[PDB]
């Protein structure tokens, strides 16, 4: 592809510049090129990949929600056509991310394995948001399966305060509530995660304490919203 002749280190450098310039489409393309060099991503590089695509699909999701709202309130072909255009672009980016995960990234260490499986759950969840038919059922199953495998690893190999583990639990609980029609499971997961993290905060440094408690606070916010 277009990044094939560029050095891996140059792609990473340019991804960081693109983030500074808030050029997230560029950033995603640079990180995709870096993944395609075939070496494993470092922790920092995983975060670059994630924040790039998060912002790209975040913009698409927000636009899709605006257009969907206009369309349902109306219910010419123009609103449907344009919603469909945005939807197709969104699906294309999710397919790109899922393809990178399956072809290159998902394979050793708990930190990376859980990070990528959580990502897989997240991007199937974004596909599920715009899906409808039996298609939606299959996509929901794919999201659940990825999240569940990530959960199993995180509970065996990570402490309950680990920020990757906490963020996984947060998003899996959102999946339960918003996608899978399982608010009781969502609430149970958020509560047990929060409580088990709370009990282990005493083991952490000042900086690690802040890292973990910020995510715990998000779990609490969702619990207060839901109950």
């Amino acid at each position: 592809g277009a990044m094939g002749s560029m050095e891996r280190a140059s792609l990473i450098q340019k991804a960081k510049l693109a983030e500074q310039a808030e050029r997230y489409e560029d950033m995603a393309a640079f990180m995709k090129g870096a993944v395609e060099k075939g070496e494993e991503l470092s922790c920092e590089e995983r975060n670059l990949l994630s924040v790039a695509y998060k912002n790209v699909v975040g913009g698409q999701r927000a636009a899709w929600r605006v257009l969907s709202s206009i369309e349902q309130k109306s219910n010419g072909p123009e609103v449907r056509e344009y919603r469909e255009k945005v939807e197709t672009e969104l699906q294309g980016v999710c397919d790109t991310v899922l393809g990178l995960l399956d072809s290159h990234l998902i394979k050793g260490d708990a930190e990376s394995r859980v990070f990528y499986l959580k990502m897989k759950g997240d991007y199937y969840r974004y596909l599920a948001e715009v899906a409808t038919g039996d298609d939606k059922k299959r996509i929901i199953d794919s999201a659940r399966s990825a999240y569940q495998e990530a959960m199993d690893i995180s509970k065996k190999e990570m402490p309950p305060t680990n920020p990757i583990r906490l963020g996984l639990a947060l998003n899996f609980s959102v999946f339960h509530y918003e996608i899978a029609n399982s608010p009781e499971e969502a609430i149970s997961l958020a509560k047990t995660t929060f409580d088990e993290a709370m009990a282990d905060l005493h083991t952490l440094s000042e900086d690690s304490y802040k890292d973990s408690t910020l995510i715990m606070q998000l779990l609490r916010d969702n619990l207060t919203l839901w109950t």
């Binding site: 924040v51 959102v174 998000l218």
Partner: peptide, 7 residues
């Protein structure tokens, strides 16, 4: 909808 991880 319910907010997911913002980081």
């Amino acid at each position: 909808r319910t907010p997911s991880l913002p980081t």
